[PDB]
Amino acid sequence: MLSLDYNNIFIYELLTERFSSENPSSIDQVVTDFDGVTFHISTPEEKTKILISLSMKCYPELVNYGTLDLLKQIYGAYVHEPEMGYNFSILIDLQQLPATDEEKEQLAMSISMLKRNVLAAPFHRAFTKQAELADLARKDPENAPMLDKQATSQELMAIHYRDEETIVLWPEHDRVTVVFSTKFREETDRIFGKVFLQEFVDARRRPAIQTAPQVLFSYDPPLEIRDIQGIQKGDDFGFVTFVLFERHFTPQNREDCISHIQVFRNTLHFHIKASKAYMHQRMRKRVADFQKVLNRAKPDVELERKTATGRSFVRA
Amino acid sequence: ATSQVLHILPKPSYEHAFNSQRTEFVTTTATNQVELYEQDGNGWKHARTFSDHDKIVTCVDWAPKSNRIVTCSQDRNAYVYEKRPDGTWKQTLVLLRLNRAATFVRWSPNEDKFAVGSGARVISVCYFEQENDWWVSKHLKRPLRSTILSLDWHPNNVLLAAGCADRKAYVLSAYVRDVDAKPEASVWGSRLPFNTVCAEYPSGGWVHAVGFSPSGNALAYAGHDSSVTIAYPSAPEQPPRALITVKLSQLPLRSLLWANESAIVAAGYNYSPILLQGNESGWAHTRDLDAGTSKTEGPVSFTALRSTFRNMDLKGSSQSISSLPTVHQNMIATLRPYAGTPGNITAFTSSGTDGRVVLWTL
Numbered sequence: 001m002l003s004l005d006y007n008n009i010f011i012y013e014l015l016t017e018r019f020s021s022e023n024p025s026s027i028d029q030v031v032t033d034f035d036g037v038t039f040h041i042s043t044p045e046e047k048t049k050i051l052i053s054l055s056m057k058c059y060p061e062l063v064n065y066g067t068l069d070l071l072k073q074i075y076g077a078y079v080h081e082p083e084m085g086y087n088f089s090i091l092i093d094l095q096q097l098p099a100t101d102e103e104k105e106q107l108a109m110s111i112s113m114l115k116r117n118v119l120a121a122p123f124h125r126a127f128t129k130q131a132e133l134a135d136l137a138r139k140d141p142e143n144a145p146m147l148d149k150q151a152t153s154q155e156l157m158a159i160h161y162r163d164e165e166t167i168v169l170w171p172e173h174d175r176v177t178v179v180f181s182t183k184f185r186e187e188t189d190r191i192f193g194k195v196f197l198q199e200f201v202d203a204r205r206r207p208a209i210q211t212a213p214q215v216l217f218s219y220d221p222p223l224e225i226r227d228i229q230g231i232q233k234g235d236d237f238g239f240v241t242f243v244l245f246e247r248h249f250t251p252q253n254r255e256d257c258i259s260h261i262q263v264f265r266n267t268l269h270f271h272i273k274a275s276k277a278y279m280h281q282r283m284r285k286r287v288a289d290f291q292k293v294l295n296r297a298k299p300d301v302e303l304e305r306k307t308a309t310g311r312s313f314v315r316a
Numbered sequence: 317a318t319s320q321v322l323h324i325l326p327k328p329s330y331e332h333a334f335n336s337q338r339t340e341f342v343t344t345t346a347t348n349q350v351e352l353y354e355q356d357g358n359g360w361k362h363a364r365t366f367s368d369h370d371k372i373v374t375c376v377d378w379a380p381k382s383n384r385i386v387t388c389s390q391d392r393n394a395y396v397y398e399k400r401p402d403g404t405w406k407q408t409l410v411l412l413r414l415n416r417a418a419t420f421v422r423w424s425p426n427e428d429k430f431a432v433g434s435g436a437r438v439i440s441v442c443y444f445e446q447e448n449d450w451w452v453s454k455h456l457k458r459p460l461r462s463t464i465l466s467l468d469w470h471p472n473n474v475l476l477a478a479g480c481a482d483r484k485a486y487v488l489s490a491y492v493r494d495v496d497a498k499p500e501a502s503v504w505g506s507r508l509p510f511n512t513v514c515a516e517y518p519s520g521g522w523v524h525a526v527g528f529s530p531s532g533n534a535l536a537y538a539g540h541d542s543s544v545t546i547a548y549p550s551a552p553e554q555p556p557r558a559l560i561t562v563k564l565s566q567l568p569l570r571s572l573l574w575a576n577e578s579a580i581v582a583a584g585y586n587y588s589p590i591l592l593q594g595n596e597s598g599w600a601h602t603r604d605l606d607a608g609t610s611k612t613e614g615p616v617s618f619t620a621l622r623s624t625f626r627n628m629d630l631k632g633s634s635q636s637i638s639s640l641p642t643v644h645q646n647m648i649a650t651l652r653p654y655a656g657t658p659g660n661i662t663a664f665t666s667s668g669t670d671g672r673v674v675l676w677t678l
Contacts, residue, residue: 296631300623 004267006259008033011041011052012112015092019104024048024094034266035162037115040086048094053086054114058161065157067121074110074117088118116259122157122169123176123258127249129155130171134246137173148172152224160230165265168225176249179222180240181231182265184272190236192272197238200268214243240264317591317605318677319643323353323360325671330649332667333378333385338654342385343667344373350387368395368407375420379427386410386430388418394432394442396451410451412440420466426473428495431456433464439478441490456488456511466571468527471658474499474508477535479523485537485547487514503533505552517547517559524584525572530659534596536580538569544582548596560599562592571651575661575678581605583651583666587642589676605676608641646670 010031018024024047031039038055059067071088072079080091090111098107110117133151137144156170164185169178184193201217203209217240220226220233231237242261249257305313325343332343340354340363350366350373370391378385385397385405394410412418416435423430429443432453437460440453462481469476469490476490489512491499499506504514521541528535535547542564548557570584575591579602583589588606592599624634631637639645646669654675656662663677 292630292632296637 004263004270006116006263007109007112008039008115009112011039011114012108014041015050015108015111016105018050018094019097019108021094033115034269035115035165039114040083050092050094051080051083051089052092052111052114053083053089054118055086056115056118057163058159059087059118061159062118062121065122065125065159067118070121070124071118088114090114116262119159119161119262120258122159122167123261126155126157126169126171126176127254130173130176130246133171133173144173156224156228158225158228158230166228166230168228168231170224174246176244177222177224178242178244178261179225180242180265181221181225181237182240182268183235183237184269189269189272192275193238193268196268196272196275197240200240213245213248216241216243317603319606320675320677321643322665322673322675325351325667325673327671328646328649328669329667329671329673330669331375331377332650332665332673333376333652334654334665335378335383336380341673342376342378343673344376344387346372348373348389348391350376350385364405366395366397366405366407368409369393374418377421377423377430379423382427384423384427386421386423388421388432390417392416392418392434394418394421394440396430408451410442410453412442412453413455414438414440419464422467422469424469424473424490425471428473429490429492431467431469431476431490433467433478435463437461437463439464439467439476439488439490441476441492443492443495454490454492454510456490458511459486459488459513459516465522466525470504470528471530471532472499472502473497475504475514475528475532477526477528477537479526479537481522483519483522483539485515485517485519485523485526485535485545487517487535487549488512489514503549503551507552514552515547515549515556517545519543519545521568524568524570525582527572527574529574529577531577536572536574538572538582538584540568542566542568544569544572544580544592544599546580546594546599558596560594560596562594562599562601564590564601566590570647570649571666573651573653573661573664574659575664576659581651581661581664581676581678583648585647587640587644587646587648589648589651589664589666591678605678606642608643611641643674644668644670644672 028042083089164183166181184190327345334341348369352363354363369389397405420433439456519539521539525538545561567585569582591603593602654663
């Protein structure tokens with residue numbers, strides 16, 4: 001694979017089975033995910049009823065940035081009391097299930113999409129507030145810089161979404177800026193991570209990909225995040241900034257852009273691993289050419305003619 | 317000087333001996349077998365294998381007048397082989413009583429006894445008793461401190477030189493009573509009982525090779541430091557008249573042979589025999605016997621088509637891997653008299669780790 005899926009594959013496949021099934025069996029399944037997230041899927045009252053539940057260490061921050069109204073909008077009737085030990089929970093009934101195979105497909109997708117629907121709330125808060133500031137700035141272009149200056153400090157979101165990261169984002173009348181305060185703690189990933197983060201910034205400075213968000217990088221923080229909690233300049237973090245302009249989150253694009261920006265650091269983490277799998281296949285190619293430099297030291301003798309299994313043979 | 321390549325053996329050939337008729341030769345392949353080769357018009361043919369050893373054979377020798385072969389191996393045994401009237405060879409185990417491998421063996425000039433060097437810090441001088449039909453071993457052991465790398469006997473039956481890995485060349489009496497006649501009073505001594513020591517000569521590196529002058533009045537020996545030393549003794553308990561060391565510019569010598577009282581051939585890791593000349597005033601390296609010292613289209617065969625593709629595939633490119641300019645392609649392990657009166661070698665032979673057996677005429 002060249003780029004990560006946005007949804008949890010297991011919940012998609014599992015619900016695609018049970019929504020097709022004529023005869024459901026019971027389940028009890030904890031299921032890990034990226035960024036320290038964890039799902040629990042089980043059938044607690046009946047084989048007929050699936051409870052999907054989510055655990056995520058920063059969910060208390062995400063409830064401040066309006067998460068429950070987004071989840072109640074998406075999951076509606078299926079929302080349930082949080083399972084003990086989990087932050088959020090949804091109860092889907094296989095007999096009360098939607099009618100068509102394309103309703104079943106989009107419900108199995110929507111429920112597997114839970115990690116990026118819970119982590120989307122601060123992005124929708126920023127996109128919908130930039131739509132207000134875009135109208136206020138269009139009412140007075142000389143007031144607009146001061147609306148941006150106050151929204152840069154008053155409307156800023158920060159999510160400590162895993163212990164070696166922070167995502168910080170804020171609206172201004174023409175953009176949403178998002179900064180990843182990103183660190184690789186595993187030292188062989190820190191060494192490759194310098195290459196992967198540097199070549200990521202140097203890629204944006206080429207004619208082919210000018211249509212993308214303006215990425216920027218440093219290792220100290222952008223001036224407008226220098227006093228956020230957990231952001232510290234000395235601790236060998238790197239500060240990848242994306243500036244999403246109004247053209248990067250136009251109504252056709254918003255949902256792909258939210259899905260695609262959250263997965264950023266996870267594609268670099270995956271591609272650092274998948275680059276070791278590349279360097280190895282390129283190393284064992286050079287080893288196989290050093291074989292030729294030693295083979296010229298073996299004196300020429302014909303090894304005797306043998307059958308395919310190595311047993312001796314008597315012809316020619 | 318001229319080189320003639322007598323045979324190419326399929327495996328390394330640390331040692332060989334030609335019989336007194338020069339009609340057949342024995343040789344030690346780098347396994348527990350010993351090959352016997354015979355003339356085939358101008359060629360040579362494999363006649364028989366001896367195989368009585370348990371482990372790798374280390375050295376072999378063939379008594380001129382009495383026609384018996386003797387063999388050593390890492391199995392710590394020796395065998396003496398003697399011709400039965402029907403044409404085959406009678407093996408006979410010799411109880412060497414060695415705690416570690418046998419390295420190197422020589423028949424004495426009267427062929428009544430033979431000496432075997434060892435890794436066990438000792439040399440087993442073996443002789444035969446018609447009273448018992450045994451071979452019995454006497455251990456020389458007093459001064460020897462490490463593995464024995466080579467032996468040579470004096471032209472009188474008593475004195476034995478040995479090169480040892482403790483960087484020294486020993487001269488020992490191997491007089492065994494009720495085999496030897498009395499030794500003549502001579503430069504090395506006259507009070508001469510078994511294991512009395514006539515010299516403990518120094519070297520810079522391991523002494524690979526030793527050999528007395530044809531007159532017996534000097535010893536030459538050769539170091540892994542790539543020097544040849546010639547020692548001229550005076551009398552017992554007395555310093556030598558000269559201890560001339562000539563240092564070569566080449567890789568080490570492994571074997572050594574007096575051509576006459578004034579000239580020596582030597583050979584080894586340099587892939588080529590060399591000639592040294594001198595006397596008790598001084599010695600110098602004087603010639604290389606190999607012209608390789610100077611470092612000197614048509615239809616195409618199926619085996620040249622197949623090998624030019626197998627070269628492109630297994631190796632870098634089509635082009636052949638070159639020969640060395642010398643006749644031998646690997647270290648020349650042993651160097652042996654072949655023709656001329658004793659003390660005027662006119663031709664000698666050598667056998668290599670590459671498996672070439674070669675005749676050299678001076």
